[PDB]
Design a protein around this ligand. Structure first.
Ligand code: NAG
Ligand code: NAG
Ligand code: NAG
Ligand code: NAG
Ligand code: NAG
Ligand code: NAG
Ligand code: NAG
Ligand code: NAG
Ligand code: NAG
Ligand code: NAG
Ligand code: NAG
Lengths: 367, 50, 49, 50, 100
């Protein structure tokens, strides 16, 4: 049902830092008993981590905001009694565009890329159970996937958290990759400090554009929520040094951008450095902004007029004309010609939108 | 001798080594990546031999 | 097909360093400095400050 | 090919060596691990008079 | 279409390669095509095959667009109606058995 929730005390997240968690496996090549340097979108060490709560004291607190999904995220959740049960991925989160829904009910995890109409306040509920109050209809649908669950029954009550669940979500080449690790913890009110490596879980082919995401929470329903918390981090392009063992599992890693000591370790390709003075390189000031500066020409080149002529030329008397002071937009001919031959020699055809030429000549004939 | 060696090492950066251009910037500007790998590899081999 | 006419247009490009006359439809952002960035000046790319 | 005492993961098929070499391969039909050794022996010296 | 099969390749440009289907630059596999004028052409015209003509930007490799929202091809914003300078983004192929 499409029902708003009442009695929540606003969304106000706290912040923390993730010491060494979030290391996963780049690419898919098998490696064992070696040290490699890899460039990829990792979660940098000691990066700020958004913290959200879910508890009742008799003011309720349910944190399900809409967050950005840029280059992938890190998701961790210390939990007791399994309040967190799924996520929503998409770009507009309505009927206009397709969205990805990951939901775990009492026995199975249900994944389907579909065209949902989500409500203002999506959430699940359980008495006994009474769930699926997050959408109204989905209509045209593309993908479906059911496998073994990750989360446990929503019932229960204790005094301390018991399990920590970590997830890494990525979206490359039309593939939704998921990495996970499940560990038992006895922490009270914080994210644990330590190193974690996440193994591949699924490789769902979705083929959708994902920019925004949100979490799905479970209420007990005059409704109450058991104590739970989840943490959000953002991946950034870094260079990491990873160590593989004989099983092909990562056991240690260093972030080559954290500090000068990690820089020296990454430069020397070793996890330990002897006493002395070492020449380091590339202190990792990686750029994060891209700028473009182009001239003030705005009128479009007369490709339609050139291609629309009644007669072109004879091949022995081919006509040559110069094109200048315009914008070369080949997309305006897509409804007219459908070029049967398009071959470029000095440039790549995909780089034409990024290039500016001093002068251009056009030769026309019919063969 | 030492100064001349360093100066020659610097001046060797303008060699094409068989690529379209010796400037790395105007290879990634004009060529799509999988086609640009060939030129980049030639430049890497030459500059690594130097 | 093979005895039917085909209209052939061949374009010759000239980069040079003179002011550009034909450009792509890319949109221009505002300029920032004193910061290591990726830039694109008339099709010439790079990284620096 | 010979019989090997190495233990593979239940879903593994190949075993790689330090110098990016194939060490042991699991037979697809009879699920046993066979180690691979080159048949060329290095370290043969020929002692001859003229 | 017959003249757009060359666009099913890594690194190509065109409406097919920019608006409805793109291949990754590191693609590993094979591309297979064959003429199907025998059972995909109808005497009156087969208009059940559709392609996208307008999009705000090119799509990523192996990405799919399903949305059918009106495309704003003019300065003034439009509504669910096409009207002027705003078009339905999807157009239908025209397949006749006598087509060249
Ligand atoms: C929930 O509240 C919002 C505004 O606070 C409103 O727009 C929306 O319609 C409400 N939900 C339902 C199901 O009416
Ligand atoms: C990272 O978090 C731990 C746990 O709260 C904290 O002790 C440590 O100081 C944090 N790191 C930094 C650099 O402050
Ligand atoms: C961590 O980053 C967030 C991002 O907005 C910021 O609000 C917070 O103040 C930062 N905390 C620290 C300790 O730098
Ligand atoms: C999505 O929901 C809205 C509101 O109920 C409706 O107007 C729209 O037609 C729906 N989309 C589809 C494709 O049915
Ligand atoms: C969970 O979802 C699956 C869908 O495959 C369904 O078969 C099953 O009955 C559901 N169980 C509950 C308790 O909702
Ligand atoms: C969308 O739904 C309509 C009606 O169910 C159907 O005719 C059409 O083929 C669907 N489109 C896609 C892309 O699934
Ligand atoms: C990983 O390697 C250890 C030895 O270091 C071995 O005991 C263990 O069984 C291996 N993992 C699995 C899943 O077998
Ligand atoms: C050529 O131009 C005329 C008038 O400008 C126009 O009616 C016609 O559609 C054009 N031809 C093509 C193929 O666009
Ligand atoms: C594209 O050309 C066809 C030719 O039949 C025409 O019907 C259609 O309206 C054109 N589309 C646009 C957006 O002009
Ligand atoms: C494969 O088939 C052969 C021949 O029937 C048999 O000897 C062998 O045990 C089979 N292996 C497996 C794994 O089924
Ligand atoms: C994904 O959706 C956002 C939403 O505005 C859009 O800006 C972006 O261009 C889309 N990406 C692609 C590759 O189409």
């Amino acid at each position: 049902q499409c029902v708003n929730l009442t009695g929540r005390a606003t969304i106000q997240p706290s912040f923390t830092n993730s010491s060494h968690r979030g290391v996963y496996y780049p690419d898919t090549i098998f490696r064992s008993n070696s040290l490699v340097l890899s460039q990829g979108y990792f979660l940098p060490f000691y990066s700020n981590i958004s913290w959200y709560y879910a508890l009742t004291k008799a003011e309720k607190r349910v944190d399900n905001p809409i967050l950005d999904f840029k280059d992938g995220i890190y998701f961790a959740a210390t939990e007791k009694s399994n309040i967190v049960r799924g996520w929503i991925f998409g770009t507009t989160l309505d009927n206009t565009s397709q969205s990805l829904l990951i939901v775990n009910n009492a026995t199975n995890v249900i994944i389907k890329v579909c065209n949902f109409q989500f409500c203002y306040d999506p959430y699940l509920s359980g008495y006994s159970t009474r769930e699926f109050a997050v959408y109204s209809s989905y209509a045209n649908c593309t993908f479906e996937y059911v496998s073994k669950p990750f989360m446990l029954d929503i019932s229960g009550k204790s005094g301390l958290f018991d399990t920590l669940r970590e997830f890494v979500f990525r979206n490359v080449d039309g593939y939704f990759k998921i990495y996970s690790k499940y560990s038992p913890v006895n922490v009270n009110s914080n994210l644990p400090t330590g190193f974690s490596a996440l193994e591949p879980l699924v490789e769902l082919p979705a083929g959708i554009n994902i920019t925004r995401f949100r979490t799905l929470l479970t209420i007990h329903r005059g409704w109450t929520v058991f104590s739970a918390a989840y943490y959000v981090g953002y991946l950034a392009p870094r260079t990491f040094m990873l160590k593989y063992n004989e099983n092909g599992t990562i056991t240690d890693a260093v972030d080559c951008s954290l500090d000068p000591l990690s820089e020296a370790k990454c430069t020397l390709k070793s996890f330990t450095v002897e006493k002395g003075i070492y020449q380091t390189s590339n202190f990792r000031v990686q750029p994060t902004d891209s700028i473009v500066r182009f001239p003030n020409i705005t009128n479009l080149c007369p490709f339609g007029e050139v291609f629309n002529a009644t007669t072109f030329a004879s091949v022995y008397a081919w006509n040559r004309k110069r094109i200048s002071n315009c914008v070369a937009d080949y997309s305006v001919l897509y409804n007219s010609t459908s070029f049967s031959t398009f071959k470029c020699y000095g440039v790549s055809p995909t780089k034409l939108n990024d290039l500016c030429f001093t002068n251009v000549y056009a030769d026309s004939f019919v063969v | 001798q030492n100064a001349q060696a360093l100066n020659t090492l610097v001046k060797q950066l303008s060699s094409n080594f068989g690529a379209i251009s010796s400037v790395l910037n105007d290879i990634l500007s004009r060529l799509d990546p999988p086609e640009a790998e060939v030129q980049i590899d030639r430049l890497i081999t030459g500059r690594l031999q130097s | 097909v093979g005895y039917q006419p085909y209209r052939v247009v061949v374009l010759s490009f000239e980069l040079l360093n003179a002011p550009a006359t034909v450009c792509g439809p890319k949109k221009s952002t505002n300029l920032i400095k004193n910061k290591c960035v990726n830039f694109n000046f008339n099709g010439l790319t790079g990284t620096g400050v | 090919l010979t019989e090997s005492n190495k233990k593979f993961l239940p879903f593994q098929q190949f075993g790689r060596d330090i110098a990016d070499t194939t060490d042991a391969v699991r037979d697809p039909q009879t699920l046993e691990i066979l180690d691979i050794t080159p048949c060329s022996f290095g370290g043969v010296s020929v002692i001859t008079p003229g | 279409r017959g003249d757009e099969v060359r666009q099913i390749a890594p690194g190509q440009t065109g409406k097919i390669a920019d608006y409805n289907y793109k291949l990754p630059d590191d693609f590993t596999g094979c591309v297979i095509a064959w003429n199907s004028n025998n059972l995909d052409s109808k005497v009156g015209g087969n208009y059940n095959y559709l392609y996208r003509l307008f999009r705000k930007s090119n799509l990523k490799p192996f990405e799919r667009d399903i949305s059918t929202e009106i495309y704003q091809a003019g300065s003034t914003p439009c509504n669910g109606v096409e009207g002027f300078n705003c078009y339905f983004p999807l157009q239908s192929y025209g397949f006749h058995p006598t087509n060249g």
